[PDB]
Paper text:
To facilitate [name]-[name] cocrystallization and reveal the mechanism by which [name] recognizes [name], we generated a chimeric protein with the C-terminus of the [name] PDZ1 domain (residues 11–94) fused to five amino acids (TSTTL) corresponding to the [name] residues 356–360. The crystal structure reveals a polymeric PDZ1 arrangement with the carboxyl terminal region TSTTL of one PDZ1 molecule bound to a neighboring PDZ1, which leads to the formation of a linear PDZ1 filament throughout the crystals. The [name] pentapeptide (TSTTL) binds PDZ1 in an extended conformation, forming numerous contacts with β2 and B and burying a total solvent-accessible surface area of 692 Å2. In addition, the side chain hydroxyl of Thr-2 hydrogen bonds with the imidazole ring of His72, with its side chain aliphatic carbon making direct hydrophobic contacts to the conserved Val76. Specifically, the interactions with Thr-1 include a direct polar contact from its side chain hydroxyl to the side chain of His27 and a water-mediated hydrogen bond between its carbonyl oxygen and the side chain of Arg80. In PDZ1-[name], the side chain of His29 is oriented toward the hydroxyl group of Ser-3, participating in specific ligand interaction; whereas in other three complexes, the imidazole ring of His29 points away from the bound ligands and does not engage in any peptide recognition.
Interleukin 8 receptor, beta ([name]) is a G-protein-coupled receptor that mediates neutrophil migration to sites of inflammation and controls the positioning of oligodendrocyte precursors in developing spinal cord by arresting their migration. We recently showed that [name] formed a complex with its downstream effector phospholipase C (PLC)-β2 via the scaffold protein Na+/H+ exchanger regulatory factor-1 ([name]) in neutrophil-like cell lines and bone marrow-derived neutrophils.
Author numbering: 9 to 99
Write the structure that this text describes.
């Protein structure tokens, strides 16, 4: 499809089941290590995705800690707007 994928996760007993990682001296958070059978896997999340929005807010210019805080403060449901970095660029 033309729109970025929107992954809608409901928190489970072992969390969401994915890792979030940022680079050295550069903004942008990426998905890593999507656990098999997790809410992240069921929602369509894939390691290698770049995270663009959390619950309708753009997180491309925020620090790693700011993005983690947004995810954790949410009431156990997150909508993650993600893109494939190989084909997608922010300008
Ligand atoms: Cl990680
Ligand atoms: Cl690392
Ligand atoms: Cl990974």
């Amino acid at each position: 499809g033309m729109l970025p994928r929107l992954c809608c996760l409901e928190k489970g007993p072992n969390g969401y089941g994915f890792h979030l990682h940022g680079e050295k001296g550069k903004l942008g958070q990426y998905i890593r290590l999507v656990e098999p059978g997790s809410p992240a896997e069921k929602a369509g999340l894939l390691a290698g995705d770049r995270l663009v929005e959390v619950n309708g807010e753009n997180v491309e210019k925020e620090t790693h800690q700011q993005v983690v805080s947004r995810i954790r403060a949410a009431l156990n449901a997150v909508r993650l707007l993600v893109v494939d970095p190989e084909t997608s660029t922010t300008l």
